[PDB]
Design a protein around this nucleic acid. Structure first.
Length: 114
RNA sequence: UAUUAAUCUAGAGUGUGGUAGGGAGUUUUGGAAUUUCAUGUGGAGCGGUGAAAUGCGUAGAUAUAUGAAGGAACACCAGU
């Protein structure tokens, strides 16, 4: 029910999530690799993120979606496939930005696995 | 060489001017991020690994935006 908006995607090293939102901060709909049939370790693939982004773009099309900001989050090899999905979808993407939860050198993270 | 009577300034220190440096201690401030809580948005998976599984999830998690709290450590300056 809104033309302008923002859709967020967070490509974790183990999974990915995409979520379309209005500029007021509320969510409209979200999608993830788990929403599709295949599960387990095979869900951390760029193809899975691509189909998730395809589905979220589809389900926001009926909403009447228009020019939209893009905040990409997380690290992984599947985030760019969502970019291809959205660009090829014909949507009115207008701005790209980086919103990884990057911290300054503060709290101590987990260790080296070894 | 040792002892002693002395003398001098290059040895070594003090002064003068200029001069750099994350040198140290004490006393204050800040912001990112995590976590918890609260507020809305939402409905099934999330997390996880070589692959899985304990574990978490409609009693609304993850996510998204805002606010509060507390604690810890100070990317980018950073280097033949």
């Amino acid at each position: 029910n809104v033309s302008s908006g923002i859709i967020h995607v967070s490509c974790s090293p183990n999974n990915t999530i995409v979520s379309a939102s209005d500029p007021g901060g509320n969510v409209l709909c979200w999608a993830s690799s788990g929403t599709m049939g295949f599960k387990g370790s095979r869900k951390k693939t760029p193809y899975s993120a691509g189909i998730a982004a395809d589905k979220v773009a589809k389900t926001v099309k009926e909403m009447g979606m228009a020019t939209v900001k893009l905040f990409v989050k997380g690290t992984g090899r599947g985030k760019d496939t969502a970019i291809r999905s959205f660009a090829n979808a014909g949507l009115s993407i207008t701005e790209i930005n980086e919103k990884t939860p990057i911290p300054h050198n503060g709290c101590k993270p987990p260790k080296r696995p070894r």
